[PDB]
Amino acid sequence: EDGYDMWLRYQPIADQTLLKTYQKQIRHLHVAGDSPTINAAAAELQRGLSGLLNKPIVARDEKLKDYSLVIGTPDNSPLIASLNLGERLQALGAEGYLLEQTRINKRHVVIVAANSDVGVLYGSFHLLRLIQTQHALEKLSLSSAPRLQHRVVNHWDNLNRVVERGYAGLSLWDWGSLPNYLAPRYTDYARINASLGINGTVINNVNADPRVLSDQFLQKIAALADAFRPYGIKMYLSINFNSPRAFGDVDTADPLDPRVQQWWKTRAQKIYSYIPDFGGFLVKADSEGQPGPQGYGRDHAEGANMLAAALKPFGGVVFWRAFVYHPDIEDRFRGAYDEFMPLDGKFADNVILQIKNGPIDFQPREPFSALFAGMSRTNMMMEFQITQEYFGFATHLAYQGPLFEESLKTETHARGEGSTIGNILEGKVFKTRHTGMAGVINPGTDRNWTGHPFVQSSWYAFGRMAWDHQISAATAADEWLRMTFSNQPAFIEPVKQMMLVSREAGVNYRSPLGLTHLYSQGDHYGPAPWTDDLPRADWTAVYYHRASKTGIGFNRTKTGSNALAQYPEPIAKAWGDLNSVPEDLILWFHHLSWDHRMQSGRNLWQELVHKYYQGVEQVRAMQRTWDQQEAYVDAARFAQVKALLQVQEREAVRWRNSCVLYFQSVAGRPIPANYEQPEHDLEYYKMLARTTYVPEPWHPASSSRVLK
Amino acid sequence: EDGYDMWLRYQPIADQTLLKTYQKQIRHLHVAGDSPTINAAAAELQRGLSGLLNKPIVARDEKLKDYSLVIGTPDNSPLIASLNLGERLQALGAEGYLLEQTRINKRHVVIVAANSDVGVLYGSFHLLRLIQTQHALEKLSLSSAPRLQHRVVNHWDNLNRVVERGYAGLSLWDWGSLPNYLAPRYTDYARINASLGINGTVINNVNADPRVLSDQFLQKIAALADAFRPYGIKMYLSINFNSPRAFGDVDTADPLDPRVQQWWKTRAQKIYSYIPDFGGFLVKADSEGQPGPQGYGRDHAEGANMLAAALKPFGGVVFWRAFVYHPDIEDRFRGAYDEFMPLDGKFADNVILQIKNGPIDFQPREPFSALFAGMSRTNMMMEFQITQEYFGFATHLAYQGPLFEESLKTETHARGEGSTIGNILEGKVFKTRHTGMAGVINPGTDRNWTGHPFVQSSWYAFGRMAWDHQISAATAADEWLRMTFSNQPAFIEPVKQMMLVSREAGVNYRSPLGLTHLYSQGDHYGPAPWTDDLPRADWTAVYYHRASKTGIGFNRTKTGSNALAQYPEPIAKAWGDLNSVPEDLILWFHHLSWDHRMQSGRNLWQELVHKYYQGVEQVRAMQRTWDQQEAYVDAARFAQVKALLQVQEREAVRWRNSCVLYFQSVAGRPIPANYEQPEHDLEYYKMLARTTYVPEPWHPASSSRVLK
Ligand SMILES: [Co+2]
Ligand SMILES: [Co+2]
Ligand SMILES: [Co+2]
Ligand SMILES: [Co+2]
Ligand SMILES: [Co+2]
Ligand SMILES: [Co+2]
Ligand SMILES: [Co+2]
Ligand SMILES: [Co+2]
Ligand SMILES: [Mg+2]
Ligand SMILES: [Mg+2]
Residue A35 three-state SS: coil
Query: Of the candidates B176, B395, B447, which has its C-beta nearest A177's C-beta?
Result: B395
Q: Would you call A216 and B692 a contact, using CB atoms and an 8 Å cutoff? A: yes
Q: What stretch of H or E contains A185? A: helix A184-194
Q: To 10 degrees, the CA torsion angle through A402, A405, A410, A415?
A: 170
**Are B692 and A209 an interchain contact pair (Cβ–Cβ within 8 Å)?**
no
Contacts with A643 from chain B: Cβ below 8 Å: 177, 180-182
Using the 3D structure, point to which of B118, B144, B170 is the last residue of a domain.
Answer: B144
**Residue A219 in contact with partner chain B when CB distance is under 8 A:** no
- Closest alpha carbon to B698 in B165, B154, B160: B165
Scanning A468-559, the segments in alpha helix (DSSP H) are 473-484, 489-508, 542-545
The number of the ligand nearest the C-alpha atom of B361 reads 10
Handedness of CA A234, A450, A455, A694 (dihedral sign): negative
Give every CB contact of residue A656 below 8 A, 6+ residues apart in sequence: A509, A612, A613, A615, A616, A678
The CA distance from B248 to A255, in Å, is: 54
CA distance linking residue B668 with residue B594, whole number of Å: 10
- Please, which residues bridge with residue A282 across strands? A238, A319
Q: Which ligand is nearest to the CA of B455?
A: 5
Determine the Cα angle at B628 with ends B646 and B496, to 5°.
Answer: 85
Show residues of chain B in contact with A695, CB under 8 Å: 174-177
Q: Identify whether A552 is part of a domain.
A: yes
**Is residue A231 within 8 Å of residue A37, measured between CB atoms?**
yes
Nearest CA in chain A to B703: A160
* A209 and A301 together in one domain: yes
Q: Is A687 on the interface with B (CB under 8 A)?
A: no
Q: Which ligand is nearest to the CA of B6?
A: 5
Phi/psi at A199 (nearest 5 deg)?
Answer: -120, 15
Instruction: State whether B666 and B542 are in the same domain.
Output: yes
Collapse the DSSP code of A141 into the 3-class scheme (helix H, G, I; strand E, B; otherwise coil) and give the result: strand
Kindly state whether residue B1 falls inside one of the protein's structural domains.
no
A272 in the Ramachandran plot: left (φ > 0), alpha (ψ -120 to 50) or beta? alpha
- For ligand 2, the distance from its centroid to the CA atom of residue B702, given in whole angstroms, is 9
Task: Tell me which of B157, B163, B167, B177 to substitute to probe the interface with A (most A C-beta atoms closer than 10 Å).
Answer: B177
Look at residue A8 and tell me if it is in a domain: no
Residues of A with catalytic function: 288, 361, 389
**Burial call B614-627: b when 16+ CB within 10 Å, e when fewer:** bbbebbbebbebbe
Per-residue 3-state assignment (H helix, E strand, C coil) for A383-419: EEECCCCCCCCCCCCCCCHHHHHHHHCCECCECECCC
Tell me, in angstroms, the distance from the centre of ligand 10 to residue A43's CA: 48
Name the closest ligand to CA A502: 3
Q: What's the distance, CA B268 to chain centroid?
A: 28
Pairing of strands B551-552, A280-283: unpaired
Find the CATH number of the domain harbouring B134.
3.30.379.10
8 Å CB contact between B165 and B389? yes
- CB-based contact B181 A393, cutoff 8 Å: no
Cβ-based contacts of A395 with chain B (< 8 Å) = 176-177
B543 — contact with chain A (CB < 8 Å)?
A: no
Return the closest-CA partner of residue B119 out of B68, B71, B186, B59. B71
Q: How far is it, in rounded angstroms, from Cα B526 to Cα B518?
A: 9
Q: Are A181 and B210 within 8 A, CB to CB? A: no
- Beta-carbon separation of B162 and A644 below 8 A: no
CA distance B690 to B693: 9
Same domain, A483 and A618: yes
Q: Which residue, among A110, A103, A102, has the nearest Cα to A72 in the 3D structure?
A: A110
Q: Which of residues 133-152 of A touch B (CB under 8 A)?
A: none
| Claim to verify: residue A37 and residue A136 sit in the same structural domain | yes
Does the residue A429 lie in any domain?
Answer: yes
Under 8 Å between Cβ of A284 and A321: yes
Please name the residues between 351 and 410 in chain B that touch chain A, using a CB distance below 8 Å.
393-395
Q: Which residues of B575-587 are buried (b: 16+ CB within 10 A; e: fewer)?
A: bbeeeebeebbbb
B349, B291: one domain: yes
What is residue A84's DSSP assignment? -
- Same domain? A690 vs A703: yes
Q: Say which residues have a Cβ less than 8 Å from residue B377's Cβ, sequence separation at least 6.
A: B344, B345, B430
- Rounded Cα–Cα distance for residues B13 and B3 (Å): 18
Out of B288, B493, B595, B630, the active site residue is B288
> How close is the Cα of B442 to the center of ligand 2, in Å?
20
Do both A206 and A293 map to the same domain? yes
Q: Which residues of B touch A210 (CB under 8 A)?
A: 705, 707
Report the SS3 class of residue B142: strand
- Are B248 and A161 within 8 A, CB to CB? no
From chain A, the residues in CB contact with B394 under 8 A are: 176-177
Residue type, B663: F
* Interval between CA A130 and ligand 3 midpoint (Å): 27
**Given an 8 Å threshold on Cβ–Cβ distance, is A170 in contact with B175?**
no
d(CA A405, CA A408): 5
In a domain, B8, yes or no: no
Ligand sitting nearest the alpha carbon of B387: 10
Q: Report which DSSP code applies to B385.
A: E
- Burial call A167-194: b when 16+ CB within 10 Å, e when fewer: bbbbbbbbbbbbbbbbbebbbbbbbbbb
Please give the distance, rounded to the nearest whole angstrom, from the Cα atom of residue B160 to the centre of ligand 6: 7
CB contact, 8 Å: B270 with chain A? no
CA of B605 to the centre of ligand 8 (A): 6
Q: By CA distance, what is A184's nearest residue in B?
A: B636
Let me know how many helices (H) and strands (E) chain B has, helices first: 23, 16
Distance from CA of A501 to the nearest CA of B (A): 22
Task: Quote the CA–CA distance of B335 and B330 in Å, as a whole number.
Answer: 9
Q: Positive or negative, the Cα torsion across A550, A555, A557, A559?
A: positive
- Chain B hits for A187, Cβ within 8 Å: none
Domain limit, last residue, from A144, A168, A198: A144
B640 CA distance to ligand 10 middle (Å): 29
Residue ranges of B 183-212 with Cβ closer than 8 A to chain A? 183-184, 209-211
Are residues B100 and B221 located together in one domain of the fold? no
Query: How far lies A485's CA from each of A14, A399, A481, A577, A675, in Å?
Result: 12, 15, 5, 46, 36
Q: C-alpha angle B7/B13/B14, rounded to 5°?
A: 110
Across the interface, whether the CB atoms of A702 and B159 are under 8 A apart is answered yes
In contact, A134 and A84? CB cutoff 8 Å: no
Is residue B548 in a domain?
yes
The residue type found at A234 is K
| DSSP class of B368 | P
B89 is a domain residue: yes
Question: How far, in Å, CA of B233 to CA of B121, rounded?
Answer: 12
Q: Do B246 and A162 touch (CB under 8 A)?
A: no
Regarding whether A463 and A477 lie in a shared domain, the answer is no
Distance from CA of B138 to the nearest CA of A (A): 40
Note whether A119 and A229 are same-domain residues: no
Q: Is A629 helix (H, G, I), strand (E, B) or coil?
A: coil
CA dihedral sign of residues A98, A102, A103, A108: positive
* Residue B56 CB neighbour total at 10 angstroms: 8
- What spacing in Å lies between the alpha carbon of A218 and ligand 8's midpoint? 41
Helix (H) / strand (E) containing A438: strand A436-440
> Taking Cα atoms as reference points, which of A300, A317, A299 lies closest to residue A309?
A317
Q: Is B389 a catalytic residue?
A: yes
Residue A613 main-chain phi, psi, to 5 deg: -65, -35
Does A688 reach chain B within 8 Å, measured CB to CB? no
Q: Is residue A631 a part of any domain in this protein? A: yes
Rounded CA separation A458/A386 (Å): 6
Distance CA A516, CA A358 (A): 12
Whether A77 and A208 map to the same domain: the answer is no
**How much distance in Å is there from the Cα of B208 to the middle of ligand 10?**
13
Q: What residue numbers bound the domain in which B497 lies?
A: 472-708
B181 contacts chain A (CB < 8 A):
yes
- Out of A468, A495, A524, a domain closes at A468
> For residue A522, is the peptide bond before it cis, meaning its omega torsion is within 30 degrees of 0?
yes
Rounded Cα distance between B638 and B634, Å, is 6
Ligand nearest to the CA of A160: 2
B217: nearest CA partner in chain A: A693
**For chain B, how long is the longest CA-to-CA vector?**
82
Helix extents (H) in A229-382: 243-246, 258-274, 300-311, 335-340, 371-374
Residue A211 to residue B707, Cβ atoms within 8 A? yes
Distance CA B309, CA B586 (A): 44
Q: Do A420 and A491 lie in a common domain?
A: no
Q: Which amino acid is at B411?
A: E
Choose the mutation target among A693, A696, A698 for the interface with B, i.e. most B CBs under 10 Å: A693
Contact A460, A196 (CB under 8 A): yes
The tally of domains found in chain B comes to: 3
B288 is catalytic: yes
Active site residue B277: no
Determine contact, residues A48/A26, Cβ cutoff 8 Å: no
What is each CA distance from A185 to A4, A169, A259, A614, B3, in whole angstroms? 10, 14, 41, 41, 14
Residues of A in contact with B205 (CB under 8 A): none
Indicate yes or no: CB of A703 within 8 angstroms of CB of B158: yes
Q: State the alpha helices, DSSP H only, in A317-389.
A: 335-340, 371-374
Q: How far is CA B337 from CA A475, B318, B324, B369, in A?
A: 71, 20, 10, 8
Which residues on B lie below 8 Å from A697 (Cβ)?
160-162, 170, 697
Measured between alpha carbons, how far is B518 from A360 in angstroms, rounded to an integer?
50
Closest residue on chain B to A174 (Cα): B695
Q: In what order do the strands lie in the sheet with A68-72?
A: A59-60, A28-31, A68-72, A107-114, A97-104, A141-144
